[PDB]
């Protein structure tokens, strides 16, 4: 990873060599967490040290794609689909494994844990729902957290769109792109879709990846 600077001077301020995937923290942005494999490391941006490395082999689901994420109150970590107390450095509860790939994301209401298609609790750890259209997709929210997006990571890549509601999960619309979708990002002020789609057919020798913009809510 490369912690750059975009104020006026372009330089890697700190440097990480170990972890595959990092993220900022939501409420207080003084934390950047990092994870290679299945081990999560909490870092700082001021000093760059391992603040709290948490990993327990006794309680690891051991997925294929782990992505350590914070709740928007910045108190819980999803390392391998496990809740993590950042206060006294102990594990909380493990979730069951169902599709070998995706470790788990938070939902922006601070009430749930979205394992790949299992919709959990935060205080009693029960199941609310299970949607068959959440088979191995990565989720994209609005900035307020009121609509959810879905892109398939099947081998094809994202045959169409997937637009969910962030309250009761009744699906809104799946509009169709004939090409294959790779990356999908939206605005904080909720007006565009950065769509990295794949021109041409399934060819490893020729990948033409144009960028296309979509306007939110217009025929």
């Amino acid at each position: 990873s490369a912690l750059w600077g975009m104020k006026s001077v372009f330089d890697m301020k700190h440097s990480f060599t170990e972890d595959h995937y990092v993220e900022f923290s939501k409420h207080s942005q003084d934390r950047v967490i990092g994870t290679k494999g299945d081990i999560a490391h909490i870092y700082d941006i001021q000093t760059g040290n391992k603040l709290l490395t948490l990993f327990n082999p006794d309680l690891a689901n051991n997925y294929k794609r782990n992505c350590a994420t914070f709740n928007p109150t910045d108190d819980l970590v999803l390392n391998d689909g496990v809740l993590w107390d950042v206060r006294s450095a102990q594990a909380i509860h493990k979730f069951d494994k169902f599709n070998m790939n995706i470790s788990g994301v938070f939902h922006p209401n601070g009430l749930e844990v979205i394992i790949n298609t299992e919709i959990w609790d935060l205080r009693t750890f029960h199941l609310l729902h299970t949607v068959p259209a959440l088979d191995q997709c990565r989720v994209v929210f609005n900035h307020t957290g009121t609509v959810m997006y879905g892109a398939m990571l099947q081998s094809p890549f994202g045959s169409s769109f997937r637009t969910f509601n962030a309250t009761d999960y009744k699906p809104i619309a799946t509009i169709d792109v004939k090409r294959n979708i790779f990356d999908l990002c939206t605005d904080t002020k909720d007006c565009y879709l950065a769509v990295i789609e794949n021109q041409g057919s399934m060819d490893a020798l020729n990948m033409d990846t144009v960028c296309r913009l979509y306007e939110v809510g217009r025929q």
């Binding site: 069951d96 750890f125 029960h126 199941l127 068959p132």
Partner: protein, 327 residues
Amino acid sequence: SICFSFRAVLELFDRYDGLRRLVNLISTLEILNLEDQGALLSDDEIFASRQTGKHTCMALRKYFEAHLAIKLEQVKQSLQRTEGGILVHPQPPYKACSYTHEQIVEMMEFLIEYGPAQLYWEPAEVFLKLSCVQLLLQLISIACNWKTYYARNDTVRFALDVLAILTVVPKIQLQLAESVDVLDEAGSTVSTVGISIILGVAEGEFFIHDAEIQKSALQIIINCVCGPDNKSSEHTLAKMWNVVQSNNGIKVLLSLLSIKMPITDADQIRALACKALVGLSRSSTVRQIISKLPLFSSCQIQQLMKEPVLQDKRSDHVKFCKYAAEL
């Protein structure tokens, strides 16, 4: 392998050292010594050292089928006490090992559940004071990846039928996850529980076209989840519910409840898998977790109406529906 049917053969087997002269064969196997596994590479001490344990597990296999019917005689005579039993016992030379792991050795493993739940075996005391059930996990571990036919398909299958008679011991179900001294295919000393290996077998990522192995695997699970109701003996079975719920045991059974490729024993696996769900879903947390799945959305019903193999229809499909409306 055969002469254990005569009881005086086992009687002289235990007045001497017994399994101390048997386990010393397996513990001296240089194909098991991880610290010295890269020492010998000549094919003289490989094909002969991957055959020696194979006949040793079969020496164990008819050893425990015999001692299952021995202790069943020490159950059906000491517990029944003329209530459905006849006290005539000459100690004869007579073959009474029931001779069928397809039907009745499977059945004798079930009636030991009605015992005292304080099961004491001299087959078990020498076993767990030596504590070589961890070694049994290493026999199943190394046999996963040989891939050049050292008669290895039966070798793990003979290793599994050591387990299915031993798994009714309560304190050996305590030692199914505690000691984790195992190794994997990544070329390093790792640590996983013994239940995850059997579940790794019961999925079928290894041992691709094997059929008797999974049905020898599911009898290990059914010994651990579908027991009786009987504040310490209840807690052990409650702990066994928690470890299967811990190490993703709810993942595997939902796939084996729809297996279709070995079309002979298609119906023999699901009825021996649905029996575990009835055992496990008495757990408090696990009731709500299974009840919301797409298993109970639909297609639980549509595994009861198809009759995919019409030949085990009146044989084993109709005992699947005994475990279906029970669920």
